[PDB]
Symmetry: C3
């Protein structure tokens, strides 16, 4: 009697799970919104903007109309190698963004010290791949927020360690590994030689020099005792346990709400697998919400949910999409896009600005939101699924993405827009104010910027 | 000199063969129609209506427009496991229908007794997968009928054992294995403890308790001597020998005639592989032909061919399709569908009824057809390819499928239609008669039913 | 710590490389056009017209509109086996054409003798696959020419050995292996029994009978010392080293210029993988350029580049495409196609003829082109990607392809067209001259042929 080998793990639920971290896939938490949970862990923030500032070159006529395809190919080739390292070292990749990848090792407080050693070794091996990234590491308390409505879900991690991992990454230069102050306080200092960072309490890792009898392979195996989903046994040849998920309609109903409908259409083999890799004109509406206090989801969770409920209703009118949400220094940011593939509407510029002002006016009145700021920028951006086969996400990359992001931070409390949006809106000129030009990070020659003042005085 | 490993078995002819049993793939019989052949074997009828009555839940708004995709995913996950068991135990899966799967072990008469033991063990292992199916087993003489024209082919198995396997399956409750009276007469009673079935000559298998020195693995190997196509040797890791078919234009020309053109288009990579999984509105025209004598293909074969020739010409006018043909208790049934994906026409309801009446009038005059009955029902049905990667078939599932099927049996000798068809036809009301409402199996609240009386008195 | 196995080699750059020989993939030569290089090697010309004269049968109504699909399936099944033999024996497949496959073993002059032995054994093993091809072998100096513009590239091999391999193949009968005179002069005569060819200096291989202590496996291994890209070590299970190419935007930019945009669209998963396999009506414009001297790229290279520059500008107006370029007996031939899938225009016939006359008039004035001849033929041709998964090319096959090719050779110095083109052009009849009918190889009943004389006297 024969024993044919199994082949089939390529179910829709597995394809959906590629777009999500284990934090969500195996979370099995309540469907109430907002949902908040609390834990401890180590965060790794890998800055990949050496690789993503290349989107300019790929718009060149040299690439003969295959710019988007070449860009996603070379990006995924390099990001895939980073992903594999994170996953084999036991990390859960939470999110991809144009300029970064955030990973989490969730553990009980008593194992933080040893897990930081694992994460530092992982970091050093990532830098070894490119002998061009910057790595910030943090550790400590982490809060998770899940918000959404009956058809869509989003999640965020928040807290001091999340803020810390961003600050640490910003301090880093090429090939640096920077530990947040609490990570350095928590780590095993017998193992790692550091140096101080000027004017900073964070530290830079110079060396991982373990004691004479230390065996990293045996140490790592001991650490896998605390990793709930590390592929093992019969499945030790897989990068993710999620690769083994089996059909389960209740679970798939839950997980699909995190993924854009156009991606679900490709997952269902109802759209060509390359339709979503494109250089295309879009309008970015980057919404920033600032609170009094950054690291307490119990106060900001309800506010973000209330904002989200209004944002989704405004965007739906114009097939706008929330591509990503981020949280830093008591600012929660929504990266909204008008014009994604198959979602284009006429008067995109006008409607982007009217939607921004609607969001601005509503969210300004939401309890506990202190300031709303919105940047609106329009131009050619790269869109596509970025990452590894087993862990990837739809992402947008481009100068206009970075411009809208810097505008909402450098011009707080107002709706701003770039010259493309201003000139191509069908709105009267006195609806706008020409702004002073500010030197903004990563922005060279943004063009004239405007405040959308709106229809009345 | 290198020895690269072979990879390629994914030819069109192999993809086509997934949709067909070995009875056809390796049949190499005449192209004359009708064709009849005669043999002996064991039939297994696995009732999967615990799984297919779920189509209701998947039309719920809870599934956010991915009902069809979730349904085919979970169905195929469970049906695939049944298929693998049947195939490793040496069976040939003849047909899939919404509510069942029919498999055949064809053998010489002298090996029936031992093959029934194999099939009973297979049955018990299928029930073990779900520790929700019902299994009927029959054995004896089996006739095969192949009918069609120059471009399309269909096949049927007929005879007392085919009738027996249906009756046995109907007697079964969840987790039962029921042996037809001839199967019990033919089987190895030293091996299996049975109990009587009230008012029935069939029996229920309680236990497979073989003698002290019995080794099932060695017994099965001896039984593979009589299985012409059991994967073996270099190919012992395959579920089907058909996986190894090599291009052969004359054979592919023959096999493609059994498969719908929309499926061939997907096989040829000219249509997206998920286009055919849909919840869509269709009209089912379920045609039943009753003969004087059920189990003699020599008399009914020519009649079915003559009917088919007319049915295909009527359907072609409106891109109707024969999805399945079945044979029971001297009734041959055609499951016809108007509105399959890419085959929709306007006035579908009117044309369904006019086509039914045309079929009715013609087939009523075919020699040896005693009664024609046609049920017409319209609504949302699931359509998609159901089964295992190596053995699957396009199938339709839904309350309206079951309703049309019950209508042709409970209202024999006439054309009947449901309320959706009546209300949405463009035909005058006096073309119809409102019928008494009958309690019908599996039908709850069918709605008012009508006879299509037709244009004149 | 787990060690998952690598899976991913299916990058766009790898898919592109399937369409190209190693001569180009690993060439890393200048982007100047024309580019010429010079080397030595052994050529094998495998004539597959036993297999490709079948396109007639597959247009029959017997194939029920799946003629193209069945044809490409059976062709690729047989051609794939030839390709695998060539590749394992160390050859580089340069080109596929309807009626042939050309392969190259490039080596230093001192290793020619031993490589010819390898190539003869390869040839005999190819004939063993079909126990229906004809094989010609040549050896000696080979020139390579690369021509094109900033977006498209084409290459050719030229010289006496290239002419020789064609002549040798023409002399061959079914199952023959014919050695060109220089190949016989260069080979190891202790190894191979030959017989003379009537009126020819070429020879036919009767037998490969090596000396008593000869071990072909050990001999082949010694010969792999001179094969730069023979898959080895960790990659000894691959047919091509190109299967391991990694993303490299500068290299992909270079390689894509050799591949049609419709193929690139399929490679990018933006078109269905079977869209390009079709039986469709096209117009073939077969352009032949004859020079004074055939085997010196230094003189003919600049002329072909100048012609190409004009040809591409004329074709672009009507989405005509260069499908293949060939070089024989100081004739360089361009196989141009109007009407490829997704490239159809109205008045295709008129524009084909006007484009031919434009090309004729320009190329007739190019320095060192002695004669231009153009054949124009219109009808149903097979189009599709022909070859092995790892080495394949888009190809056109059909009686009208062969007719246009014979017309440009049998009617030199003029533009000729077939009856379909003449009757369906919108041009006046006195623009044409009815020609004497010539008996042409492989052409039976071409129909009346015409010279396109053009608008004035």
């Amino acid at each position: 009697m024969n024993t044919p080998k199994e082949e089939f793990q390529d179910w829709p639920i597995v394809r959906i799970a590629a777009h999500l971290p284990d934090l969500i896939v195996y979370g099995h938490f309540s469907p109430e919104r907002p949902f908040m949970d609390y834990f401890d862990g180590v965060l790794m923030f890998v800055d990949i903007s050496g690789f993503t500032a290349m989107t300019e070159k790929f718009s060149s006529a040299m690439y003969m109309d295959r710019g988007a395809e070449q860009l996603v190919e070379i990006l995924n080739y390099h990001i895939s190698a980073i992903v594999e390292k994170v996953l084999i070292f036991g990390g859960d990749i939470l999110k991809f963004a144009g300029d970064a990848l955030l990973a989490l090792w969730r553990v009980e407080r008593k194992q933080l010290k040893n897990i930081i050693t694992v994460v530092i070794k992982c970091s050093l091996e990532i830098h070894g791949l490119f002998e061009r990234v910057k790595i910030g590491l943090a550790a400590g308390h982490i809060s998770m927020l899940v918000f959404g409505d009956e058809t869509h879900s989003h999640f965020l991690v928040i807290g001091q360690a999340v803020d810390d991992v961003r600050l640490a990454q910003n301090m880093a230069q090429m090939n640096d590994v920077i530990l947040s102050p609490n990570c350095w306080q928590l780590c095993d200092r017998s193992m790692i030689e550091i140096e101080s960072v000027p004017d900073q309490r964070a530290v830079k890792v110079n060396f991982l020099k373990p004691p004479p009898n230390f065996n990293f392979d045996e140490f790592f195996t001991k650490c896998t005792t605390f990793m709930h989903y590390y592929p093992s046994g019969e499945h030790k040849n897989l990068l993710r346990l999620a690769c083994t998920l089996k059909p389960d309609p209740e679970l798939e109903m839950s997980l699909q709400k995190y993924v854009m409908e156009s991606i679900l259409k490709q997952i269902d083999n109802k759209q060509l697998q390359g339709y979503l890799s494109e250089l295309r004109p879009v309008t970015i509406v980057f919404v920033n919400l600032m609170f009094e206090d950054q690291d307490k989801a119990e106060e900001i969770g309800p506010a973000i949910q209330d904002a989200y409920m209004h944002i989704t209703s405004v965007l739906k009118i114009f097939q706008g999409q929330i591509n990503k949400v981020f949280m830093f220094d008591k600012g929660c940011s929504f990266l909204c896009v008008f014009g994604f593939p198959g979602e284009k509407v006429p008067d995109e510029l006008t409607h982007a600005l009217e939607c921004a002002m609607d969001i601005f006016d509503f969210c300004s009145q939401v309890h506990k939101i202190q300031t709303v700021s919105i940047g609106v920028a329009s131009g050619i951006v790269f869109c596509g699924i970025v990452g590894h086969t087993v862990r990837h996400e739809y992402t947008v990359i481009g100068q206009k993405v970075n411009l809208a992001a810097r505008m909402m931070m450098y011009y707080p409390g107002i709706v701003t827009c770039d010259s493309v949006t201003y000139n191509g809106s069908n709105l009267p000129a006195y609806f706008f104010k020409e702004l002073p030009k500010k030197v903004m990070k990563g922005v060279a020659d943004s063009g004239p910027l405007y405040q959308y003042w709106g229809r009345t005085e």
